[PDB]
Design a protein around this motif. Structure first.
Motif, PDB file in Angstrom:
ATOM      1  N   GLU A 227     -27.951  15.663   6.430  1.00 57.35           N
ATOM      2  CA  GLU A 227     -28.827  16.660   5.809  1.00 57.35           C
ATOM      3  C   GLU A 227     -29.463  16.165   4.514  1.00 57.35           C
ATOM      4  OE1 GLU A 227     -26.873  20.400   5.415  1.00 57.35           O
ATOM      5  OE2 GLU A 227     -26.787  20.783   7.573  1.00 57.35           O
TER       6      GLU A 227
ATOM      7  N   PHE B 290     -35.390  18.037  13.001  1.00 48.26           N
ATOM      8  CA  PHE B 290     -34.013  18.492  13.136  1.00 48.26           C
ATOM      9  C   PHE B 290     -33.828  19.538  14.228  1.00 48.26           C
ATOM     10  CE2 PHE B 290     -32.299  16.924   8.917  1.00 48.26           C
ATOM     11  CZ  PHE B 290     -31.245  16.246   9.496  1.00 48.26           C
TER      12      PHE B 290
ATOM     13  N   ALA C 297     -10.860  26.626  10.826  1.00 47.65           N
ATOM     14  CA  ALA C 297     -12.111  25.976  11.186  1.00 47.65           C
ATOM     15  C   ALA C 297     -13.136  26.022  10.065  1.00 47.65           C
ATOM     16  CB  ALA C 297     -12.697  26.614  12.448  1.00 47.65           C
TER      17      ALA C 297
ATOM     18  N   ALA D  72     -31.016  18.631  16.930  1.00 44.88           N
ATOM     19  CA  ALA D  72     -29.636  18.768  16.474  1.00 44.88           C
ATOM     20  C   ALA D  72     -29.080  20.174  16.679  1.00 44.88           C
ATOM     21  CB  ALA D  72     -29.531  18.377  15.000  1.00 44.88           C
TER      22      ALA D  72
ATOM     23  N   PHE E 179     -18.604  19.635   4.144  1.00 44.29           N
ATOM     24  CA  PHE E 179     -19.786  19.821   3.314  1.00 44.29           C
ATOM     25  C   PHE E 179     -19.503  19.615   1.833  1.00 44.29           C
ATOM     26  CE2 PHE E 179     -21.500  22.561   6.888  1.00 44.29           C
ATOM     27  CZ  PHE E 179     -22.433  21.619   7.267  1.00 44.29           C
TER      28      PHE E 179
ATOM     29  N   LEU F  66     -29.189  29.073  12.611  1.00 38.79           N
ATOM     30  CA  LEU F  66     -29.228  27.620  12.475  1.00 38.79           C
ATOM     31  C   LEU F  66     -30.420  27.029  13.217  1.00 38.79           C
ATOM     32  CD1 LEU F  66     -28.259  24.598  12.398  1.00 38.79           C
ATOM     33  CD2 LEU F  66     -26.787  25.219  14.324  1.00 38.79           C
TER      34      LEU F  66
ATOM     35  N   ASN G 106     -27.294  31.502   7.179  1.00 42.36           N
ATOM     36  CA  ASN G 106     -27.569  30.251   7.878  1.00 42.36           C
ATOM     37  C   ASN G 106     -29.018  29.815   7.696  1.00 42.36           C
ATOM     38  OD1 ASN G 106     -25.337  30.114  10.802  1.00 42.36           O
ATOM     39  ND2 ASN G 106     -25.088  29.509   8.655  1.00 42.36           N
TER      40      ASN G 106
ATOM     41  N   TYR H 127     -10.720  31.352  12.441  1.00 42.94           N
ATOM     42  CA  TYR H 127     -11.850  31.313  11.516  1.00 42.94           C
ATOM     43  C   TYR H 127     -11.484  30.602  10.218  1.00 42.94           C
ATOM     44  CZ  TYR H 127     -16.145  32.902   9.264  1.00 42.94           C
ATOM     45  OH  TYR H 127     -17.368  32.957   8.637  1.00 42.94           O
TER      46      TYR H 127
ATOM     47  N   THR I 262     -30.208  26.298   6.027  1.00 40.62           N
ATOM     48  CA  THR I 262     -31.070  25.356   6.730  1.00 40.62           C
ATOM     49  C   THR I 262     -32.424  25.183   6.050  1.00 40.62           C
ATOM     50  OG1 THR I 262     -30.047  26.356   8.681  1.00 40.62           O
ATOM     51  CG2 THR I 262     -31.682  24.627   9.047  1.00 40.62           C
TER      52      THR I 262
HETATM   53  C1  LIG Z   1     -25.316  25.163   8.735  1.00 40.91           C
HETATM   54  O1  LIG Z   1     -24.419  26.223   8.831  1.00 40.91           O
HETATM   55  C2  LIG Z   1     -23.212  25.881   9.446  1.00 40.91           C
HETATM   56  O2  LIG Z   1     -22.306  25.490   8.792  1.00 40.91           O
HETATM   57  C3  LIG Z   1     -23.068  25.999  10.964  1.00 40.91           C
HETATM   58  C4  LIG Z   1     -23.399  24.701  11.794  1.00 40.91           C
HETATM   59  C5  LIG Z   1     -23.037  23.353  11.158  1.00 40.91           C
HETATM   60  C6  LIG Z   1     -23.571  22.179  11.918  1.00 40.91           C
HETATM   61  C7  LIG Z   1     -25.061  21.921  11.710  1.00 40.91           C
HETATM   62  N1  LIG Z   1     -25.833  22.179  10.563  1.00 40.91           N
HETATM   63  C8  LIG Z   1     -27.156  21.786  10.849  1.00 40.91           C
HETATM   64  C9  LIG Z   1     -28.286  21.830  10.061  1.00 40.91           C
HETATM   65  C10 LIG Z   1     -29.469  21.371  10.600  1.00 40.91           C
HETATM   66  O3  LIG Z   1     -30.628  21.406   9.833  1.00 40.91           O
HETATM   67  C11 LIG Z   1     -30.794  20.306   8.994  1.00 40.91           C
HETATM   68  C12 LIG Z   1     -29.533  20.888  11.886  1.00 40.91           C
HETATM   69  C13 LIG Z   1     -28.405  20.843  12.678  1.00 40.91           C
HETATM   70  C14 LIG Z   1     -27.199  21.293  12.170  1.00 40.91           C
HETATM   71  C15 LIG Z   1     -25.859  21.408  12.653  1.00 40.91           C
HETATM   72  C16 LIG Z   1     -25.519  20.994  13.982  1.00 40.91           C
HETATM   73  C17 LIG Z   1     -24.047  21.199  14.147  1.00 40.91           C
HETATM   74  N2  LIG Z   1     -23.507  22.374  13.422  1.00 40.91           N
HETATM   75  C18 LIG Z   1     -22.510  23.377  13.814  1.00 40.91           C
HETATM   76  C19 LIG Z   1     -22.842  24.774  13.239  1.00 40.91           C
HETATM   77  C20 LIG Z   1     -21.599  25.669  13.504  1.00 40.91           C
HETATM   78  C21 LIG Z   1     -21.558  26.941  12.667  1.00 40.91           C
HETATM   79  O4  LIG Z   1     -20.325  27.591  12.850  1.00 40.91           O
HETATM   80  C22 LIG Z   1     -20.101  28.227  14.078  1.00 40.91           C
HETATM   81  O5  LIG Z   1     -20.970  28.368  14.870  1.00 40.91           O
HETATM   82  C23 LIG Z   1     -18.706  28.752  14.411  1.00 40.91           C
HETATM   83  C24 LIG Z   1     -18.310  28.818  15.726  1.00 40.91           C
HETATM   84  C25 LIG Z   1     -17.061  29.297  16.056  1.00 40.91           C
HETATM   85  O6  LIG Z   1     -16.631  29.364  17.390  1.00 40.91           O
HETATM   86  C26 LIG Z   1     -17.560  29.782  18.353  1.00 40.91           C
HETATM   87  C27 LIG Z   1     -16.203  29.703  15.056  1.00 40.91           C
HETATM   88  O7  LIG Z   1     -14.929  30.181  15.381  1.00 40.91           O
HETATM   89  C28 LIG Z   1     -14.884  31.546  15.682  1.00 40.91           C
HETATM   90  C29 LIG Z   1     -16.595  29.639  13.728  1.00 40.91           C
HETATM   91  O8  LIG Z   1     -15.720  30.055  12.717  1.00 40.91           O
HETATM   92  C30 LIG Z   1     -14.980  29.017  12.136  1.00 40.91           C
HETATM   93  C31 LIG Z   1     -17.857  29.161  13.388  1.00 40.91           C
HETATM   94  C32 LIG Z   1     -21.658  26.498  11.222  1.00 40.91           C
HETATM   95  O9  LIG Z   1     -21.313  27.522  10.302  1.00 40.91           O
HETATM   96  C33 LIG Z   1     -21.770  28.835  10.493  1.00 40.91           C
END
Ligand SMILES: COC(=O)[C@H]1[C@H]2C[C@@H]3c4[nH]c5cc(OC)ccc5c4CCN3C[C@H]2C[C@@H](OC(=O)c2cc(OC)c(OC)c(OC)c2)[C@@H]1OC
Ligand SMILES: NCCc1ccc(O)c(O)c1
Lengths: 382, 385
Positions: free
Chosen positions: A220, A242, A333, A245, A341, A149, A16, A330, A20
């Motif tokens: 992004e 950011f 989702a 967010a 993406f 994140l 992550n 998982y 980011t």
């Molecule tokens: C980036 O990396 C990701 O893709 C994560 C996030 C994607 C997205 C995001 N990117 C950003 C980048 C930024 O900088 C520029 C600033 C803000 C954001 C935001 C704000 C909004 N945001 C959401 C993030 C969510 C994460 O995923 C989970 O937390 C999750 C939760 C679950 O339940 C509790 C699950 O189920 C068990 C699961 O498995 C499917 C995964 C997800 O993947 C790990």
């Protein structure tokens, strides 16, 4: 059993943070080499979008192969692959000098991310068999993803103009090397995903999650370019802009996980999608950095609301109708995030090349607002 | 002065809308001594014809000013109340509603036009119309129980006589301040009405008010029929069910008349659309009387938000592009109001028997939600060359 949890948390954190940290650095790195400043990134937005969607495309391609590979050769050997390919990716990112090497780093990172995400979670599931600590371990891993994140964005933005360009990548490389040494000293079939997507309700939930995440997905790759083109912010504030967010996202997921069961999950998802659309509409109106504090925080809070209201409904739908596995939610989702993406950054470059920037946010806002009434279907599925 | 003009419009909309809701619990009870359709069309007579008189009232205000149309509305309202106090037949309980609709159209168009004309500043103009809508909400809130108690304890002819006396007081006040004794033509030649539907922004605002008022007006005639079918509630709760809607509408219009200039007209109208759509979606899910308090209050707040946001925006657009004559655009707004209030009661039972009440609420909420993104267009309309 704690060591495997530590290595899984560290691996998800590293993935992550890399995802980011690439966002602050790539546009400013492209701008610095060629020549606030002059505006010429409109031609390069499409290649930036393709580069950002490369990891999503590679993860979608390599996802189904990773499934039966773990059964044949266990879980340690493919979990060992994630650390090494992440090491190659983070080394190539630090020493990359041309656009072509960054693409190879992005696809290599996508392959390593998919391998690590499958293997570490499988190892966590195999290690814990008490049927109660597994949920706590999964929650700790998800909290680690949230922390990564949160902390990835200020990393690269702060330590690009201060301590060099290659600085934020070698630290991640050293952290990955620490993860590898930790994991080195180590030691029922569920309706498959290709059939779970055949019912309308799970497809509706996945589409809701994907359209909620598409706002951040298109925010992004294109936001820093707009920032340098319009608001003249310094190079150390692009990743600073950011923080809301993620902060508002964590606040929203905590609060609405506590309070969405009382007032209905579908209503929470509906209002979350609606304020996602409103925040995306209000994003292109700011003329300074402080104007983005409101809409970005609202978008993060809305996405947290949508996720917290959509994951339990997906779990209940899978449990009621089909047969569920430990990580069934998982797969569905993750496909929504992967599809978002993959389709966001690629189409966004063409959209911003053809027409102006704010029309993309208007299009996404109307899309979210239109899809929002479709959440009526999910209340009491049969 | 500019403060007493708002006093006259406050009283004028208070009494005109007072007669609208007073007839609701006294007229159906009188006729009892297919019947639902006959009673339903009686209520929709005022809404049906005030649509027609509105296009003839807008351009008419340019040549004679605003005082004479509102004095005529007072005269017709007095005639309607005196006819209500004496008539006791279906055929005589129809021309009275006709006159009430004509007077309501005259009073609404004249009052909104004079409020737009006197109040020039947009930020200041956004509060006078808010307080006028608050007065209209007060009239609609206080009309029904007043008529119910007056019919219960003193008889049928008592509340209409009291309304006639209050109308006489309002007419004396109007003669005191407004002085409706001469015809004064406006110097600026207003734009023709058929060109004001050729621009999208005025059409978007009119559709906004129209859709919000459909969403509110369809629920009233259809709610008690569904309540008696599923909830099995006593008769007296039927009037108390929609009390939160009126209270929330008054509170919302009073607050957002102040808040609209600060926070934004388009955002206010947008959020009002989303709130009313979600309220309409959540309305048919309640299983008891207590479950309608929340959605009805949110619905009324959404209506207040939309009305307070889109009232000054019409004059704002007309000043931005067209000539400074505000009669026609507020005539269009009143047309949207009355057509929304007229389509509902006459066809609500038919639509409920055809497709069903929950499906009807679903379509109304979906149209409101989909039309909500269209309010972004009014963020900054370009001016004229
Ligand atoms: C980036 O990396 C990701 O893709 C994560 C996030 C994607 C997205 C995001 N990117 C950003 C980048 C930024 O900088 C520029 C600033 C803000 C954001 C935001 C704000 C909004 N945001 C959401 C993030 C969510 C994460 O995923 C989970 O937390 C999750 C939760 C679950 O339940 C509790 C699950 O189920 C068990 C699961 O498995 C499917 C995964 C997800 O993947 C790990
Ligand atoms: N523009 C009128 C909006 C409205 C609000 C509440 C009501 O009860 C009602 O009859 C009408």
């Amino acid at each position: 059993r704690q060591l495997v949890l530590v290595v899984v948390f560290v691996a998800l954190l590293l993935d992550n943070m890399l995802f980011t940290v690439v966002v602050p650095i790539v546009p400013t790195f492209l701008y610095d080499m060629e020549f606030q400043g002059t505006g010429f990134l409109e031609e390069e937005i499409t290649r930036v979008g393709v580069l950002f969607a490369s990891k999503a495309v590679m993860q979608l391609l390599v996802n189904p192969f990773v499934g039966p590979l773990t059964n044949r050769i266990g879980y340690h050997i493919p979990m060992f692959a994630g650390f090494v390919i992440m090491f190659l990716s983070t080394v190539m990112f630090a020493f990359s000098g041309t656009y072509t090497l960054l693409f190879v780093a992005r696809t290599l990172q996508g392959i390593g991310s998919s391998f690590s995400s499958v293997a570490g979670l499988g190892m966590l599931a195999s290690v814990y068999t008490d049927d109660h600590e597994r949920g706590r371990a999964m929650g700790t891993a998800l909290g680690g993803l949230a922390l990564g994140l949160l902390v990835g964005a200020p990393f690269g933005s702060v330590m690009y103009e201060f301590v060099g360009k290659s600085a934020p990548f070698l630290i991640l490389a050293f952290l990955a090397l620490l993860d590898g040494a930790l994991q080195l000293c180590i030691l029922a079939k569920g309706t498959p995903l290709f059939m779970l997507l055949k019912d309308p309700y799970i497809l509706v939930a996945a589409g809701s999650i994907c359209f909620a995440n598409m706002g951040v997905a298109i925010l992004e790759p294109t936001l820093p370019i707009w920032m340098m083109q319009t608001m003249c912010s310094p190079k150390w504030q692009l990743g600073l802009a950011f923080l809301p967010a993620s902060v508002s996202y964590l606040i929203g997921t905590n609060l609405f996980g506590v309070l969405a069961n009382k007032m209905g999950r579908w209503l929470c998802s509906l209002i979350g999608m609606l304020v996602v659309g409103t925040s995306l509409l209000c994003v292109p109106l700011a003329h300074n950095i402080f104007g983005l504090i409101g809409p970005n925080a609202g978008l993060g809070l809305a996405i947290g609301m949508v996720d917290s209201s959509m994951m339990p409904i997906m779990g209940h739908l899978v449990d009621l109708r089909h047969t569920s596995v430990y990580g069934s939610v998982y797969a569905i989702a993750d496909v929504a995030f992967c599809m978002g993406f993959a389709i966001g950054p690629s189409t966004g470059g063409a959209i911003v090349k053809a027409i102006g920037f704010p029309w993309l946010m208007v299009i996404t806002g109307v899309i979210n607002i239109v899809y929002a009434p479709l959440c009526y279907y999910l209340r009491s599925p049969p």
